[PDB]
Design a protein around this nucleic acid. Structure first.
Ligand SMILES: [Mg+2]
Ligand SMILES: [Mg+2]
Ligand SMILES: [Mg+2]
Ligand SMILES: [Mg+2]
Ligand SMILES: [Mg+2]
Ligand SMILES: [Mg+2]
Ligand SMILES: [Mg+2]
Ligand SMILES: [Mg+2]
Ligand SMILES: [Mg+2]
Ligand SMILES: [Mg+2]
Ligand SMILES: [Mg+2]
Ligand SMILES: [Mg+2]
Ligand SMILES: [Mg+2]
Ligand SMILES: [Mg+2]
Ligand SMILES: [Mg+2]
Ligand SMILES: [Mg+2]
Ligand SMILES: [Mg+2]
Ligand SMILES: [Mg+2]
Ligand SMILES: [Mg+2]
Ligand SMILES: [Mg+2]
Ligand SMILES: [Mg+2]
Ligand SMILES: [Mg+2]
Ligand SMILES: [Mg+2]
Ligand SMILES: [Mg+2]
Ligand SMILES: [Mg+2]
Ligand SMILES: [Mg+2]
Ligand SMILES: [Mg+2]
Ligand SMILES: [Mg+2]
Ligand SMILES: [Mg+2]
Ligand SMILES: [Mg+2]
Ligand SMILES: [Mg+2]
Ligand SMILES: [Mg+2]
Ligand SMILES: [Mg+2]
Ligand SMILES: [Mg+2]
Ligand SMILES: [Mg+2]
Ligand SMILES: [Mg+2]
Ligand SMILES: [Mg+2]
Ligand SMILES: [Mg+2]
Ligand SMILES: [Mg+2]
Ligand SMILES: [Mg+2]
Ligand SMILES: [Mg+2]
Ligand SMILES: [Mg+2]
Ligand SMILES: [Mg+2]
Ligand SMILES: [Mg+2]
Ligand SMILES: [Mg+2]
Ligand SMILES: [Mg+2]
Ligand SMILES: [Mg+2]
Ligand SMILES: [Mg+2]
Ligand SMILES: [Mg+2]
Ligand SMILES: [Mg+2]
Ligand SMILES: [Mg+2]
Ligand SMILES: [Mg+2]
Ligand SMILES: [Mg+2]
Ligand SMILES: [Mg+2]
Ligand SMILES: [Mg+2]
Ligand SMILES: [Mg+2]
Ligand SMILES: [Mg+2]
Ligand SMILES: [Mg+2]
Ligand SMILES: [Mg+2]
Ligand SMILES: [Mg+2]
Ligand SMILES: [Mg+2]
Ligand SMILES: [Mg+2]
Ligand SMILES: [Mg+2]
Ligand SMILES: [Mg+2]
Ligand SMILES: [Mg+2]
Lengths: 175, 141, 45, 77, 59, 111
RNA sequence: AAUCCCCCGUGCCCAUAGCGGCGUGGAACCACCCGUUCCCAUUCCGAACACGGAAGUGAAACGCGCCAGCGCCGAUGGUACUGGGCGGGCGACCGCCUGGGAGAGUAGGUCGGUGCGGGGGA
RNA sequence: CACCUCGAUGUCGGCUCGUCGCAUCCUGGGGCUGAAGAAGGUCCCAAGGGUUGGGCUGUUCGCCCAUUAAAGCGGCACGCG
RNA sequence: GCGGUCGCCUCCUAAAAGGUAACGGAGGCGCCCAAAGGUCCCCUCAGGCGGGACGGAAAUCCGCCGGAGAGCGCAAGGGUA
RNA sequence: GCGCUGACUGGGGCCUGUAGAGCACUGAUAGGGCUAGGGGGCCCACCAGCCUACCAAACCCUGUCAAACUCCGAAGGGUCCCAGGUGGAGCCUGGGAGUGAGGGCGCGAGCGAUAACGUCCGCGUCCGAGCGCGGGAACAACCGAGACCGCCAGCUAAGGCC
């Protein structure tokens, strides 16, 4: 549930050298902040496999603090498909957009034996406060029969918050 | 055989193979993918030799995505060569494929099943490949 | 149809272009001569 | 054989004096196809859309957004 | 202060404008040192040839 | 509906003026009043003003107008000003505007 | 006179001033509005344009505010590319140095600013 | 393609004389066989030697007759006036 | 040789000034208009949606939305409410 | 003859639409949804008419491509100003030419087959005319380097030191 990694600071020191050093360059920012940071690559991978902009990484870093960062971009260099830079978005309480994973819970839920599961989105974008952060979203919907398409408000909408809308869309259907 | 319907110009210049880049590249549609290690013109008749290798392995099952497309016209001079008079005579089409791009990219199949199909699929290709899975790094979007 | 504009007398003037059968008429329009100033200028030949 | 094979002469178009060059009345300033530099202060524009100093002066360029690009001659040469 | 530029590698086979440069520093031959003022223009040429030349700062 | 006939014809008649590069004598006629400024463009500056508002007069606006006409010459001619270009803006040159114009003679000339 | 605020002109920046939604203004200005005798008008129509007005309304228009759904603007880091200097690969092509350095995207930003002149307030 | 040779590098085929290569036609040695034996198939090793006489056509080549262990394929200015 | 071609305009090639080649990729001209010309005064598109007799995917009419994708005699480009 | 104006360099303005990238236009284009038209399979034959595991407008999600696409757009390049720059520099007038078969290599394209010691342009270089010297076994053009003469003197370059 709680993902801590590390961080450090940098000013000079070409990212070519850092990257050559096993250390993944990146930046740290929010409304109130911008700062150059680097992390260990191997460290970051193990976390990011798991974390993955769905979950909060609390950083740490020296002058030890703990910053509620979301990761909002990863730049991989296309040739080797390995990340060449990350930028960490630090939370503080203002409503903020993000991607919350979806959990489809149930049986085929209608037209069983057999339908089409057909998940349109693996995630969803939701305007949410830093304080209450809905680490996943329950989707049951006993049907879901032939010709039905789930939009938005047909979704759980955890007690924390509202959507990033537009409410008219599709998540699952059976054809 | 893929081929654009309704082209704007038949016969376009060759142009270079530089600079492995430009989209594709992150595995947007499926559970596993074939990524280009080297640049090439890959031929429609090559793409379909890959497509069929795989649908054959799924026994018409699975889902297959392709994701490179042959829009680049390939010309040729009849045999009978002599340089001049004109340019002449489109044979096939190619898609230009530089490194790090995902072609093909299956889904809805067991891992070792797809990984065997993609490996076959790869031998039909002129360049070297890499098989991949999918990632946090392939983000969300 | 190449076009040549006389005026009244002294016959020096200036020339023109008509690519059409309109006007098929006497084809006459106001212009400046090199001696007197701005007379009627009809079309001949 | 090829049914291709033409092209027309180069029209040697574009800008003939740049900003802060000293011009003279009549110097042409831009050679251009449409109206893509509109005449400014002391700049005429001929039937081929061609811009020329109205006065001796020096040339300045002005980019007025939706109003376009403008060539002026700033007098007192 | 000033600059000691000494020609260490032949310009033969380098572009004409680089050849023009060494003229502007009045270097006509290999190994020839020249001591000339450090100013922005004298610097441009000295940098333009920086691969043929060897420099030090000098009073 | 984007950019109405009013504001086109307005630009159309203005832009021509601003070319010849004279002083501009701009005219705003409203339902009640009629006002006139004399503007220097490239200094972006008004020089001489006149109106039925500031001269607090009424009684038959075409006649009011000619009066803010003679009123502008007077004030303006006093600064050295002669030779301007007559704006007329959205207005047909007619009526109240024709009259402020044709009373704007004795100074500020050629109209 | 000045400073301020509101309105009317009229410029400049040329979307951070825009669309949409809400709210608000009629004393004064402005509009709509009252008429069509008169000037002058609409390939028919005072719709418009024009004149003479002043009963009414700020409904429309406009002016002023508020909201970031849209639109528009947009870093910092990092890449691509590259002027100059060097390497590597049969090749397609790749890499290092030194200097320059995008585009998209992320953070954000914005429901304008401002000049001259009027009219009115203080 | 147009690089030496147009103040000349004679051009197909045959004949004579060969020599080399091995991607081996035969002979020798092998593995596998859907190899019972005999006889094949296929692939590996191997260039020492061998590799016929006729009909037809200028022919190379090919077809055919009769044989054979076999009737190898190439190169040498399509070897050699 | 045969075939094609030969002057002019537009675009690309053309490497962000200009210029730039090939029997490189594609197209056009050898006219036209007495209004399709000068000037003054007005007017603003295409398209979509709703409405409306004969009216249909589109004849004309009305509403709203539409910043230019329409038009500019003809090819393309640039330009342009 | 003029005589500081030259190549190159510093700063400053202006100009441009390529590399890159983008998809707003012109086209191409993968997967999905939603939907006109439709193949139809057909319910009727009167308007009807339900379904799409085929086409496929628009439209929305996701994902790409382009010499003759561009909402964007580097490095550079060009030009003017001011400075450095005295150079087998520059400008003006004249006399004399020769040349108008180029070649290789690098880089950028076209043609070709992402062939050619191929062909055609661009910017650079060398051979040409440096088949004089050193390196690369030998070798016009690759690396080094511009040979006025002499020396049984020294230091180096490339490349080398059994
Ligand atoms: Mg790629
Ligand atoms: Mg392969
Ligand atoms: Mg051209
Ligand atoms: Mg060299
Ligand atoms: Mg230069
Ligand atoms: Mg009132
Ligand atoms: Mg009231
Ligand atoms: Mg009447
Ligand atoms: Mg009418
Ligand atoms: Mg209102
Ligand atoms: Mg941006
Ligand atoms: Mg940056
Ligand atoms: Mg570089
Ligand atoms: Mg940016
Ligand atoms: Mg203002
Ligand atoms: Mg030859
Ligand atoms: Mg040749
Ligand atoms: Mg010969
Ligand atoms: Mg001889
Ligand atoms: Mg002889
Ligand atoms: Mg063998
Ligand atoms: Mg045996
Ligand atoms: Mg046996
Ligand atoms: Mg055997
Ligand atoms: Mg043997
Ligand atoms: Mg016989
Ligand atoms: Mg015979
Ligand atoms: Mg035969
Ligand atoms: Mg025989
Ligand atoms: Mg032999
Ligand atoms: Mg032969
Ligand atoms: Mg022979
Ligand atoms: Mg003989
Ligand atoms: Mg012929
Ligand atoms: Mg150019
Ligand atoms: Mg260029
Ligand atoms: Mg033709
Ligand atoms: Mg319409
Ligand atoms: Mg309709
Ligand atoms: Mg157009
Ligand atoms: Mg000097
Ligand atoms: Mg100079
Ligand atoms: Mg400079
Ligand atoms: Mg490109
Ligand atoms: Mg597009
Ligand atoms: Mg392009
Ligand atoms: Mg930008
Ligand atoms: Mg410059
Ligand atoms: Mg100077
Ligand atoms: Mg000389
Ligand atoms: Mg001479
Ligand atoms: Mg020649
Ligand atoms: Mg040359
Ligand atoms: Mg040449
Ligand atoms: Mg190289
Ligand atoms: Mg050659
Ligand atoms: Mg070559
Ligand atoms: Mg050359
Ligand atoms: Mg010679
Ligand atoms: Mg030599
Ligand atoms: Mg030389
Ligand atoms: Mg020799
Ligand atoms: Mg040697
Ligand atoms: Mg010498
Ligand atoms: Mg050494």
């Amino acid at each position: 549930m709680e993902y801590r990694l590390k961080a450090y600071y940098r000013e000079g020191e070409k990212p070519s050298a850092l990257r050559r050093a096993g250390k993944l360059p990146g930046v740290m920012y929010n409304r109130h902040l911008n700062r150059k940071v680097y992390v260990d690559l191997v460290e970051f991978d193990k976390v990011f496999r798991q974390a993955s902009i769905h979950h909060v990484i609390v950083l740490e870093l020296p002058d030890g603090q703990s910053l509620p960062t979301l990761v909002r971009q990863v730049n991989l260099d296309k040739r080797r498909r390995r990340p060449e830079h990350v930028d960490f978005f630090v939370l503080s309480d203002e409503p903020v957009e993000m991607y919350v994973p979806l959990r489809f819970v149930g049986t085929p839920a209608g037209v069983r034996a057999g339908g089409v599961l057909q998940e349109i989105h693996r995630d969803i974008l939701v305007k949410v406060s830093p304080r209450n952060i809905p680490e996943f979203i329950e989707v049951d919907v006993s049907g879901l029969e032939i010709g039905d398409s789930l939009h938005a408000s047909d979704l759980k909408l955890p007690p924390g918050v509202e959507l990033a809308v537009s409410p008219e869309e599709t998540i699952a259907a059976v054809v | 055989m893929l081929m654009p319907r309704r082209m704007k110009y038949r016969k376009q210049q060759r142009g270079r193979l530089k600079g492995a880049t430009k989209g594709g590249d992150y595995v947007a549609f499926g559970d596993y993918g074939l990524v280009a290690l080297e640049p090439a013109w890959i031929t429609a008749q090559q793409i379909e030799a890959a497509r069929v290798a795989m649908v054959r392995h799924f026994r018409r099952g699975g889902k297959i995505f392709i994701r490179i497309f042959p829009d680049k016209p390939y010309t040729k001079k009849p045999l009978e060569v002599r340089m001049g008079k004109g340019k002449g005579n489109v044979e096939g089409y190619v898609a230009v494929v530089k490194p790090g791009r995902v072609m093909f990219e299956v889904a809805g199949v067991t891992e070792e099943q797809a990984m065997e199909a993609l490996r076959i699929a790869g031998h039909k290709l002129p360049i070297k490949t890499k098989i991949v899975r999918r990632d946090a790094y392939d983000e969300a979007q | 149809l190449l076009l040549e504009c006389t005026e009244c007398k002294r016959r020096n003037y200036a020339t023109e272009k008509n690519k059409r059968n309109t006007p098929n008429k006497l084809e006459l329009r106001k212009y400046c001569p090199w001696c007197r100033k701005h007379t009627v200028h009809r079309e001949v030949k | 054989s090829t049914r291709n094979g033409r092209d027309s002469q180069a029209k040697r178009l574009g800008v003939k004096r740049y900003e802060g060059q000293v011009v003279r009345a009549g110097n042409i300033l831009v050679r251009q196809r449409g109206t893509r530099f509109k005449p400014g202060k002391n700049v005429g524009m001929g039937r081929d859309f061609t811009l020329f100093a109205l006065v001796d002066g020096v040339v300045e360029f002005q980019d007025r957004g939706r109003l376009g690009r403008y060539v002026h001659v700033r007098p007192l040469a | 202060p000033r600059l000691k530029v000494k020609l260490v590698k032949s310009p033969i086979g380098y572009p004409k404008d680089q050849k023009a440069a060494l003229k502007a520093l009045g270097l006509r031959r290999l190994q020839q040192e020249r001591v000339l003022e450090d100013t922005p223009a004298i610097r441009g040429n000295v940098e333009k040839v920086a691969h043929l030349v060897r420099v030090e700062v000098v009073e | 509906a984007r950019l109405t006939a009013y504001e086109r014809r307005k630009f159309r008649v203005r832009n021509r003026i601003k070319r010849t590069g004279r002083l501009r004598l701009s005219v705003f006629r409203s339902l009640k009043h009629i006002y006139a400024q004399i503007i220097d463009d490239e200094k972006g500056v008004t020089l001489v003003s006149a109106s039925s508002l500031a001269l607090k007069l009424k009684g038959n606006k075409t006649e009011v107008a000619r009066q803010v006409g003679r009123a502008l010459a007077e004030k303006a001619l006093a600064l050295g000003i002669k030779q301007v270009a007559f704006d007329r803006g959205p207005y047909k040159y007619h009526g109240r505007v024709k009259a402020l114009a044709e009373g704007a003679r004795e100074g500020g000339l050629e109209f």
